[PDB]
């Protein structure tokens, strides 16, 4: 079993001339160490969801598409505590009718918890956390509230390893 709730945060600066390139990609890699892991363990990357980010009173809407660098389970040997994970995010313009998931209000930066999450929890727990998350999101609650609820569900008697992201965009105009 593993039991820790661990996170890491990175910064993504959307370049000022994104409006001309209309795409940008970043890749992040982190080595987690959960010293509570005992015996052998399987760490599962949860399928991520695209996130629509609204900036400048949602007049700029960006589609964030997340993908695991490796989607396969991570297996830890007996009393192994460390593992490497990571993801790429691709930022593209969102469709004009896209519903904003995370909003910067008047500004150009947002903080997003849990853009990509791994868990040592069981299939049952992860499956039900995943469906409740998407439901919670459609239900109107904030991304943060939904991801917190999911993390707490995954972390009950298991480990959770989260990537968080700060995105900022100061467009040329």
Curated annotation (Swiss-Prot):
Cystine bridges: none
GO BP terms in the entry: cell adhesion involved in single-species biofilm formation
Domain of life: Bacteria
Gene Ontology cellular component terms for the protein in this record: pilus
Induction: Expression is negatively regulated by H-NS and subjected to cAMP receptor protein (CRP)-mediated catabolite repression.
UniProtKB keywords: Signal
Disruption phenotype: Deletion of the operon under classical laboratory conditions does not result in any major effect on E.coli capacity to form biofilms compared with the wild-type strain.
Note: The operon is cryptic under classical laboratory conditions, but is functional when constitutively expressed.
UniProt family annotation: Belongs to the fimbrial protein family.
Function, as annotated: Part of the yehABCD fimbrial operon. Could contribute to adhesion to various surfaces in specific environmental niches.
Protein's name according to its UniProt entry: Uncharacterized fimbrial-like protein YehA
Organism encoding this protein: Escherichia coli (strain K12)
Name of the gene encoding the protein in the UniProt record: yehA
Full-length numbering of the shown residues: 21 to 193 of 344
